[PDB]
Each structure stands twice: as structure tokens, then as C-alpha cells.
Amino acid sequence: FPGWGPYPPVERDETSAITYSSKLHGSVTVRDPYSQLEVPFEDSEETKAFVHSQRKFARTYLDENPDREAWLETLKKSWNYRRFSALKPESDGHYYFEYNDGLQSQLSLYRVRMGEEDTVLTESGPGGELFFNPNLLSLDGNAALTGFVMSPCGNYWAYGVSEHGSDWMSIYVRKTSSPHLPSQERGKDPGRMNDKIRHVRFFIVSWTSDSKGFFYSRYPPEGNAPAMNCMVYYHRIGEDQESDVLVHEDPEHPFWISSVQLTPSGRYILFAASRDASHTQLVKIADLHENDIGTNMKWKNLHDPWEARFTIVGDEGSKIYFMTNLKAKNYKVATFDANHPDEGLTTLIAEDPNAFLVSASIHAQDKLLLVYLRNASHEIHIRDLTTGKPLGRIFEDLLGQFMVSGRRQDNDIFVLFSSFLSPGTVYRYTFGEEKGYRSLFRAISIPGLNLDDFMTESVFYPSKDGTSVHMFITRPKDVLLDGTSPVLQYGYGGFSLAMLPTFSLSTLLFCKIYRAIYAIPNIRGGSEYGESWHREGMLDKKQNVFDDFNAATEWLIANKYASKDRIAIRGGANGGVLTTACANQAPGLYRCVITIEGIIDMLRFPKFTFGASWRSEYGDPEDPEDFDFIFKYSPYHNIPPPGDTVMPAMLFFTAAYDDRVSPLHTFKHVAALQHNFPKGPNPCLMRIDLNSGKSTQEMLEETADEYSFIGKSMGLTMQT
Amino acid sequence: VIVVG
């Protein structure tokens, strides 16, 4: 039938099956024709053949569309705008800040002497002094800075760097007196120290107060299998990693993930273990003034394991300030007296039953700054650290999200504000006795976009079960709600992750060029309406997430925001569960489905990298009761029979290698959709990357593919 | 701070 067909051959094992315990059925035998695509790309010629053919296939179709180059050109022109973070004060008396003059692959880190900061981010360029330029590390600029910490003394700088197609990293150290030079040559990291810390999978680095070494988590030496045997080690500056002192290993629970935080004073070390993706921890305190660093430290329980999470907020001698959800699912601030360990935690800021606490931090010595969630947006609240009493709101006039910078010792914070409409304003705030000094420090501006052409509405719609759901709707002020407009509708729905007002230039360009609407339904699974909003979109209520999303699409059609024939949907990772399911359950509703790094096989996820931890969210597919509710929606196992559904056009983004979400999820589902719908009529494509990111070039190329694919699929014309 | 793509 189709001009673009047939689909590339995809090989089948007609005999591959697994038998699962079922509470309703005793057991269920599930056949997996495409189980051989669980074998990594590097380790199988079949997985290679599949990746290479599906890749060539998607490319010829994406590149046959003139609008693909159109979109690449538009995006390049427009993304060429200056981007910067808030200034970040450090122990070497410098503000450090991230900058991008426009189309550099990675952010560079610049710094400026504290007191000279009003010379930076001018028409002239970033000013200050370049400290670190990631782009210089690799020739292709895919080598990425994954995190960094300055020593207490201000003389050392520990940083993580990923290589391109890998999510592992090494930790390096360089003197703060050894910055990168603008005129260094590509493909190398000059003024670094010998220290190399390999076999790290995440950057959780804590210096001791003496600046002589740092704690880090690492794994055993090196695909696809579950991540096992996370250990905490202490490294001393100057020594080879072979010398690093073991602090923690739990050989019995190899799936657990562990790390350590020091309090600001660097006196108390908090060990936290995670056994799943829930906000619960096994959690110990040691006094570093009372202990050699090693396996023979005097640990004491902060609390019974697996009831709560604990984040250090500050310390006052033997008193430690914690942000915790201990008997507070929406989180609170409580103190712990290491000198009275039996007394447990004392509430300093009570849980708000109608607002999720996002963060707490100490500024101007005794000002507690709280970020809460209300109406799927951030509110900043100031408290007296000592009494806990309210001292008022700051930035009440801004609706969006904040990133706060400033330490307890500074009377100053730098606050990055952003929203669907504001790309980033760095404000400066100075605390006073009763009231503070706010000023606008710097504001990102985009040439070739008039932000005043756009608007964001806040609507409420009922889901299937009658739950009122909040949605943001961003669109050109001058499109008619006459039921003809296309929609790009984006979802996550899980892990207590709130969809905040977020700036995306690409998104606003999509609204302008396609006279389109950008819909963000705050579906259950998120924290937007506190922790119970997550509980009503997980495990056996996971279906509520899909229901909330369908109902959003239906509200937009009913209220004339959108053509019923021009609904595009989009989701990543856990949002890939949402897209694939909604595609299976309501293919009628959707004209285009974009799945990124998608989680799709809800029976097999626990077997791959970090998937085992997702069992707290989806349920345990090897549990007979859980199997039943998981199996009803498992997108990979719920592709509709081909006779009487027309599948929407579908495009799947994935790399060939990926630690976070194993690409076998995409591989198998694509393979299966194509096998089940061999003649289309709308194409199911897999857009592959042969280096897992991410350079700005990769990102605009993906976006060009995405938008060109949506325009084609929904028969939209680009406008000028 | 555990692991969710």
C-alpha cells in the first residue's frame, strides 16, 4: 500500500516465551518474538542489522521532507541567543556562571572576582574569565561535564566527565589556579592534576573540611545487565585510586544505590541507601571528629530504615537541619541533635498539607528560604531559621520556576526565574532586617521572537473518574479557538515529577510556524498537587495517568482549542509509557506520537540497568497480583489487533547504547508495531543516534526530525 | 537522586 514501504525485515523467535505468576490466572505465558533485541547493539549482529536498517529507513523518510531542512535552518537561526545561569558564589572568592554565546555544543564555566560581578554578561560578551570549557575535551564536542565541587579551601576543583556514547564518568581534579585558556587546542584537558577516579555512574562528591580528599560512590570495573555493587570510597588528593579507602559496601543488596553527604561544617557524614525509586532511605550519621575514614566508623541510625528521605539543609554545631518527608509526605524541615540521637527529629517547619516542599536553604546566616509548589508553580517563602516563623514571600509577582544561588554566609542570593514565556531572568536579592533589596541583574533575550505574541492560560478539566486536572496552554495570542488549530501535548505522569512552566524556544517556534497550541496537562503521577497526586498515578492506579491525558486531549477538542485530526502527543522515559499506552488505548484521538528514550516493556524493565528500582512505581511484574494490573496496560503487550484500529503516525527516539532506559524497549515495540501494521497506513519509525547524549547540534537535528515528522503526519504547512 | 530518565 504505502509509497514509503515496505518496512525493513525484523527477525522473530516464534518460541521465546516467559511464564509469570498471576493472582487471577495462576500463571500466564507471554511470548516475545523480539526477545533477541534485548541483547545489546555491541554484543549481537541481529541488534546491529535491526538498528542499521531501521536507522537508514527512518532517515530516508525524515530527509524526503523539505520541511526537515526548513526546520533545521529556522531552529539554528533562532537558538543562536546568549544563555547563562545565575552567578554561584564559591570558596575562592569568585562567582562562577555557565555561559553559551549561542551555538556552542556545551555551556562553558566563567568566573569573576566577587565585587567585580557587574562587569559580566554585557553586550561585549560574558567578561570575567573562562575557567572551564567542556567543548575543548573532545574533537566532536560530545564529552560532557557531569558535575563539579570546589574544595572548602578554594584551591581544588573536582569534576566529572562522561565520554560520548557512555553514561559512566571519571572524576578529575584541577587547581582553581589552572583555568582553561580560550586558545587551548581541541581534544584534550590541559592544566589537570594526576588524580583520576574511574567506574563512577553519578557525581555525588563531598570534600572533607581539610580539603585533603573527597567521598564518592563508584561501581566495580567494566552491557545492559542491572547496575550492581554501588560502593562509597574516600579518595585523597595526590594518591592513585588503588589507594582510595573503602567506606561502604553491602554485598547482600547489590541493587541498592548508596552515597554520602557532609553537613556544611564538614563534621557529620550522612550515609543514605536507596533500594527503589521511592523517597525512602536507609540512613546513618557518623561524627568525622570521632572516627578515622573507613569501614570502622561509629554509625548511628538517623531513623528506622525505609520510612523517609533526608536531605541536609545546614548544621549548627551538633544540630543538623533536614528537609525530610518523615511523617510528612509533602515534606517538612526538622532538626536532629547528634548529641541527643534518641530524641529523633524535631519539626522546625511543619508540613503544609496543601503544598509540596521542593527545597529549603539557609542565606544571610539565619534566613530559611523555602520553595513550595502551588498551582503547578514555585513560591519562595522566607522563615527565621531559629524560631521557624514566617518573614514573608519574595518574587510573588513571578509565576514559573526558580533556581536559587547563595550560601548561608552571603546576605545575597542570585535567583534564575523562567516560565513558558520567560527564557531566564537572573535577579539579585539582599536580605535586610524586615525587608530585602531586589534588583534585576541580567535577562536572556532571543532575537527573532516577540514573547508578547504568546500567552499561557491555566485551565481545569475533569478526568474519566471526575478528578479536576490543571493544564497549562501556551499559544500565539492571535490564533482562533475555532477548533482547527493543531496541538503539541506533552506528558510525564510519575515519580512525583511536577511539569513546571519551562522555557523551550523550539516549542514557541512550533506554536508560531504551525499556528499551534502547546498543552501541558498536570496529570496524576506528578507532585503538582502534593505526594497523593503521585500515589493516584502509580502501581495499580497507573491507568489514571493515561486517563488524565486522554481527557486533556478530549477537553481541547471539545472547547475548540484543537482540531480532533491534529493532536500530536509527546513523552520521554516514563512519559514513553504514557505515549505508547495512550496510542494503544485511544489511537483514534492521536494523529502523531513522539516517544523519547521510551519505557515500553512493563514486564521486563526490572532486568535492565536501573529498571529494578522502578518496581516501586510500576509494581513488581514477578509478583502475581502486580502482574495483573501491569499486564492490562503494558504497552508492548497491548498493541491493538490490526483489523479495526488505524494506528497514528509514530516516531521513536533512542540511542543504540543507553544506561538510563535500555533501548531494547524501543527496539521490540517498533519491531512489533511494524509487524502488526505492515502496510501502515501511517508509518512507525525509529530515529537512532549512534552516540547517546548532549551537543546543541544533536538536539536541533532531533527537533527538526520531530517537528518535520509532526507537520507531515498532521498535514500542517510551515508559515512565511 | 536514585535513577529516573
Author numbering:
A (entry chain A): 3 to 224, 230 to 700, 705 to 731
B (entry chain E): 805 to 809
Study authors write:
OphP is an essential enzyme for the biosynthesis of the macrocyclic peptide natural product omphalotin A. The enzyme has been proposed to proteolytically release a peptide intermediate from the precursor protein OphMA and to macrocyclize the multiply α-N-methylated core of this intermediate to produce omphalotin A. Our *in vitro* experiments demonstrate that OphP does not process OphMA but shows robust macrocyclase activity on pre-processed α-N-methylated peptides. OphP tolerates sequence promiscuity in the substrate but has a preference for highly α-N-methylated substrates and for N-methylated glycine residue at the catalytic site. The promiscuity of OphP is explained by structural analysis of co-complexes which reveals a predominantly hydrophobic substrate binding cleft with few interactions between substrate side chains and OphP. Similar to other POPs, the monomer has two domains, an α/β hydrolase domain (residues 1–82, 453–738) and the seven-bladed β-propeller domain (residues 83–452) ([Fig fig4]).
To characterize the interactions of OphP with its presumed natural substrate, S580A mutant crystals were soaked with a ten-fold methylated Oph-18mer^NL^ (W1-^me^V2-I3-^me^V4-^me^V5-^me^G6-^me^V7-^me^I8-^me^G9-V10-^me^I11-^me^G12-S13-^me^V14-M15-S16-T17-E18) and a seven-fold methylated Oph-15mer substrate (G1-F2-P3-W4-^me^V5-I6-^me^V7-^me^V8-^me^G9-^me^V10-^me^I11-^me^G12-V13-I14-G15) ([Fig fig2]) (both substrates yield dodecameric macrocycles with the underlined residues). The Oph-18mer^NL^ complex was obtained at 2.0 and the Oph-15mer complex at 2.5 Å resolution. In the Oph-15mer complex, residues G1-F2-P3-W4-^me^V5-I6-^me^V7-^me^V8-^me^G9-^me^V10-^me^I11 were located in the electron density in subunit D ([Fig fig4]) but there is evidence of disorder in the peptide. The two complexes overlay with an RMSD of 0.9 Å over 719 residues. In contrast to the Oph-18mer^NL^ complex structure, residue ^me^G12 which is attacked by Ser580 to generate the macrocycle is not at the P1 pocket ([Fig fig4]). Rather the peptide bond of ^me^V8 is closest to this residue ([Fig fig4]). The peptide adopts a different conformation in the active site and as a result, the side chains in this complex make different interactions than the 18mer^NL^ ([Fig fig4]**)**. The substrate is not aligned properly for catalysis as the carbonyl of ^me^Val8 is tilted and no longer hydrogen bonds to the canonical oxyanion hole. The side chain of ^me^V8 contacts Ile606 and Trp621 in the hydrophobic P1 pocket identified in the 18mer^NL^ complex. **(**[Fig fig4]**)**. This complex demonstrates the plasticity of peptide recognition by OphP – rather than disclosing additional mechanistic insights – and perhaps explains its rather broad substrate specificity, as there don’t seem to be clearly specific interactions with the substrate except for the P1 pocket residue.
